[PDB]
Design a protein around this ligand. Structure first.
Ligand SMILES: CC(C)c1c(-c2cnn(C(C)(C)C)c2)[nH]c2c(C#N)cnn2c1=O
Ligand SMILES: [Mn+2]
Length: 296
């Protein structure tokens, strides 16, 4: 059977008056976005933050990911890349897999093929991605007043903007942004954030990032479906460890009454996940994202 795309999550296009402050805006859209788990925010057209990462020194060792790892139970280790050398590998993989220029591959085709490969036992596809990349060690994608890099006058409005993820509040009453370097089919499984916190993700550039989200009111139903279909060796594991292998086709959740919403996060767009909103997804191609957990 072919993959059935879930319904689209809400997309918001705030004006310059509404793009004022993120927390104020997120609080106003909450009555709708909390009912879908995730939402997308498109900044005004002329809000274009410049990429501040030192690409001349950005070197990292990605990790290997096999799409049908869970179906194999029912050695692939890697080289150091630069941001450019990784992009050349990522584009070569996608163009060779689909036999067409990378920007010509439709997003619905990659989505259908991704979930086919996840459940396919007759074809093993291996991809790589950069995760667990702290902006404190590699530098943020947004301009910042750090004491280790120079910002221009044109960059100052973005270093001080409330939508700069380095300026989000991360202290709960009684933390730095992380980086993601993706390629086609690189994916993250279903999870919620620590302390059930909010999370905001900005796609600096590259090909889209496909999201799936579940509202918080269905969190227990997802976990029940997950426990009923997960392998017996992983069902008894704590959720912190179990969330490392909780890959599941969204149609499986939808067939059991779990509401799922999707979206294609494009370059220059924000995605916000609400408290206890399970989410997962995959990258359509070579891209660069930055994310942080914040609190209200
Ligand atoms: C494919 C990669 C680069 C990726 C991952 C991911 C994959 N594995 N990991 C661990 C936890 C280190 C094992 C993280 N997460 C996310 C989110 C969220 N939330 C949003 N985009 N995104 C990604 O692009
Ligand atoms: Mn997350």
């Amino acid at each position: 059977a072919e993959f059935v795309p879930p319904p689209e999550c809400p997309v918001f296009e705030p004006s310059w008056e509404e793009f004022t402050d993120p927390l104020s805006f997120i609080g106003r859209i909450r009555p709708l976005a909390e009912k879908t788990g995730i939402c997308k925010i498109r900044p005004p057209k002329d809000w274009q933050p410049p990429f501040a990462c030192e690409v001349k020194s950005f070197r990292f060792t990605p990790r290997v990911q096999r799409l049908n790892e869970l179906e194999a139970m029912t050695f692939e280790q890697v080289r150091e890349y630069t941001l450019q050398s990784f992009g050349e590998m990522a584009d070569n993989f996608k163009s060779d897999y689909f036999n067409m220029p990378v920007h010509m591959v439709p997003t619905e085709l990659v989505e259908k093929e991704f979930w086919r490969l996840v459940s396919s036992i007759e074809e093993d596809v291996i991809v790589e991605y950069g995760a667990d990349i702290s902006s404190k060690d590699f530098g943020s994608g947004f301009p910042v007043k750090d004491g280790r890099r120079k910002i221009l006058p044109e960059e100052e409005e973005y270093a001080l903007s409330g939508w700069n993820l380095n300026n989000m509040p991360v202290l709960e009453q009684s933390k730095v942004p992380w980086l993601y370097v993706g390629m086609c089919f690189s994916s993250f499984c279903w999870h919620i954030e620590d302390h059930w916190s909010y999370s905001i993700n900005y796609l600096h550039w590259g090909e889209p990032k496909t999201w799936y989200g579940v509202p918080s009111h269905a969190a227990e139903q997802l976990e029940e479906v997950m426990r009923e279909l997960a392998p017996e060796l992983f069902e008894s594991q704590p959720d912190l460890l179990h969330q490392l292998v909780t890959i599941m086709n969204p149609n499986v959740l939808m067939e059991h009454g779990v509401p799922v919403y999707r979206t294609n996060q494009c370059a220059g767009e924000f995605v916000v996940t609400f408290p206890r909103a399970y989410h997962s997804g995959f990258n359509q191609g070579y891209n660069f994202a930055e994310a942080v957990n914040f609190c209200t």
